[PDB]
A and B are shown apart, each in its own frame.
With several copies, the nearest count.
Chain A
Amino acid sequence: KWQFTPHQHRGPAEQFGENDHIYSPKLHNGSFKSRGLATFMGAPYCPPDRHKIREMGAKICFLAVPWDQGQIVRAGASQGAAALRDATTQYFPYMFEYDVDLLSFFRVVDCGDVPTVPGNNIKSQEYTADYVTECLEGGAKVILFGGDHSLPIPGAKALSRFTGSGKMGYLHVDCHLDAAPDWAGNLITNCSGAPRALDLPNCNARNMAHMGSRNGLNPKDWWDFYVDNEIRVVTMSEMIERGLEVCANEIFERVKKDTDSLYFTWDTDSIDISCMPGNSAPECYGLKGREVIQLARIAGRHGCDILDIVEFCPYFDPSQIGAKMTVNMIYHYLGSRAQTLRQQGK
């Protein structure tokens, strides 16, 4: 059930070789110039089904959620997943910085895309919950690739249900606070990730945190939410003042303390516009390139159950910089997770 061809290509010059995927390609160029039929990481395709995932023995599911009609700003995040997948052909699944083969370590699979019902945010969000559910119930941790920032509403909801009587942490990294109680009467748009997590029966204010805030696309009520509910906000200001590693470790401890699971949503507009022009609402005064990698590394050491990444818009990026940045967000999280796991006898 769990197989892939190293360097993609079958036919006469197929490569066979248990480990060929972590080494220079031997018979041909693989997909480094031409994409062909690339999955995320060249991983096996596996339907988002608990049985199929289980029998493959997959511990990470890449699942795209391109839904971009749950949001208040501008469409475009629907195109991100394709550019992320394409960008992975520009890397090997082996990461020398961590000495791990990500692909075999996690038995990662690509669960394709969650389908959408254009115009219907309610039904599309339900599909997301259900697709995520299959991944968890199959015994895997999930990488969710958006799609607009409505994604954590179904994402957290799904992990909330799977966690049961246990407790769940919620980390939200973003230049925007995302705590509208409603937007023009709507409870489930892309700017209500945090209040909707707090509503989940097993998600508690003391295990919730926000990082990345700056600038004036942040109504007072979004700030008020964190004040009134005693939820830690670490502004970009504080992360620069006090240091990324200091602030990250502190809030990863907070959101994991006496929790069974952790939901981590990461908006690419947390990244400085200089590094990520391809975004729904890009913002200056954000994470630098090296700091994005560092945060991914730190996130990896602590670990989460679902990591989601939202709002990448490749149309507003004429280069490869956005897509490759989003590849590294994921690959550094997995490389760091694996190294941390291996330093504990696993």
Chain B
Amino acid sequence: SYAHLFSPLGGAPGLITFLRSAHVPLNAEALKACGAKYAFVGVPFDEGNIGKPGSEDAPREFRLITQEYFSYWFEYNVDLHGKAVDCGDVSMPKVSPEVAHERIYRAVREVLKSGLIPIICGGDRSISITAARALSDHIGPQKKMGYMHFGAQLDMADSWAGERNLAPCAMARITELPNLDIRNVAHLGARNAMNPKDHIDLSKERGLQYDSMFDLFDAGIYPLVERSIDRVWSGTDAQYLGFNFNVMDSSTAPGVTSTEPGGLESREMMRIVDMIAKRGGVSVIDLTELCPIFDISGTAARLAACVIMRLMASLAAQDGDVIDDKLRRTD
């Protein structure tokens, strides 16, 4: 039935799920059986965050925001109904970091086994360390991984406050993955003062070719993004895509753990989304550092939702997986 594409004709209280998705357990076999392309996994983990608290409520709010949209996206003539399922949340202990990460690891490995794309909603940015490790191990040493991340902070602290797996270390860890060549790594949006000198020093040392926000503006944005998409998707077997929405201008995304003036406008990110979609696939989608306690009218969460769902819609459009134009309500 295609009644969901259209206004209700008129004449069982559901669940908190990404996009009004069905629930499906975090189980490779069930996931392969369900027929969806994406599996949403919440990860309310906050303990790598050295800054302002709130990211553990993001998965709930993100879900809620998503409920408000139809599954149909007229701009792409695509229906997202059935393309995703929601696996619920990785259950965490507390004051238990090592075990927390181990559980995230297992969760991502499981989803990857299924052949579905995990959409991982943090939580703090350090969860990307172990989600990226999971993809690294999944594909194995004979294959090539690409990594692209959007954010105002490089997060290239070799160590932070004596520790090694906090959110500010995340890129320092991820660029040590054995099957991730630095040349297949992109980082877009870095700006302002939350970037200590050693993050720069190390980036130069390793040859991380980050596209600072200045570099992007100076290039008219899209031509530089295109070249970095190329480096990440050309001759790789699997690609990880991560978002901290402090890549966006403050006004566009207040509800993030560390807002920053001078970032991307929403329409710029929407163009960028389509440019990523041209490559016809991705292995892992992460979004971290949504912080809804500091959000006004759910602006940040709303924008994240639009970005994630447009990426889904855009991938489907370029994959030819459209809906029948001819179909009408009076059917």
Q: Which residues of A contact B (CB under 8 A)?
A: 22-29, 32-33, 90-97, 101, 177, 180-186, 191, 213-224, 235-237, 240, 272-275, 277-279, 281-286, 288-290, 292-293, 316-321, 324-325, 328, 331
Contacts and interface: CB of A to CB of B under 8 A. Distances in A.
Contact of A285 (B267, B296, B313, B323): B267
B258 A217 contact: no
Contacts of A289: 249-251, 261-263
B28 interface: no
A324 B260 contact: yes
A328 B152 CA distance: 13
Contacts of B306: 215, 283-285
Nearest to A281: B68
A288 B258 CA distance: 19
Interface string B155-179: 0011111100000100000000000
B244 interface: no
A219 B6 contact: yes
B194 to A, nearest CB: 6
Nearest to A228: B328
B75 A319 contact: no
A13 to B, nearest CB: 10
Contacts of A213: 74-75
Nearest to A319: B254
Given A29-B161, A275-B261, A328-B192, A321 B254 contact: yes
Contacts of B282: none
A26 B196 CA distance: 12
Q: Is the interface of A mostly helix, strand, loop or mixed?
A: loop
B10 interface: yes
A224 B302 CA distance: 26
Given A275-B250, A288-B265, 11 more contacts: A22-B197, A24-B158, A29-B161, A186-B10, A223-B74, A273-B266, A274-B251, A286-B266, A321-B259, A324-B250, A328-B261
29 contacts: A22-B196, A22-B197, A24-B160, A27-B161, A32-B51, A33-B49, A33-B51, A91-B192, A96-B200, A97-B214, A182-B7, A183-B7, A184-B10, A185-B9, A215-B306, A216-B74, A219-B72, A220-B72, A221-B5, A273-B303, A274-B252, A288-B249, A289-B263, A292-B261, A292-B262, A293-B262, A318-B254, A321-B261, A328-B193
A217 to B, nearest CB: 6
A41 to B, nearest CB: 10
Contact of B74 (A26, A91, A97, A220): A220
Interface string B291-331: 00011110100110010011001000000000100011100
B302 A273 contact: yes
Given A33-B50, A33-B52, A290-B262, A219 B70 contact: yes
A180 B7 contact: yes
Interface size of B as a range: 35 or more
Contacts of A286: 266
Contacts of A96: 190, 193, 195, 197, 199-200, 212
Interface string B32-63: 00000000000000000111110000000000
Interface in B125-166: 157-162
B231 to A, nearest CB: 22
Contacts of B294: 318-320
Nearest to A28: B161
B320 to A, nearest CB: 18
Given A186-B10, A221-B328, A272 B251 contact: yes
B210 to A, nearest CB: 10
A210 B200 CA distance: 38
B222 interface: no
B70 A216 contact: yes
Contacts of B75: 213-215, 235, 237
Counting chain A CB atoms within 10 Å of each CB, the highest count among B200, B258, B261, B265 belongs to: B261
A102 B203 CA distance: 21
A334 B67 CA distance: 40
Interface string B105-135: 0000000000000000000000000000000
B296 A319 contact: yes
Contacts of A185: 9-11
B167 to A, nearest CB: 10
A215 B195 contact: no
B192 A218 contact: no
Contact of B168 (A24, A28, A181): A24
B169 to A, nearest CB: 9
Contacts of B261: 275, 289-290, 292-293, 321, 324-325, 328
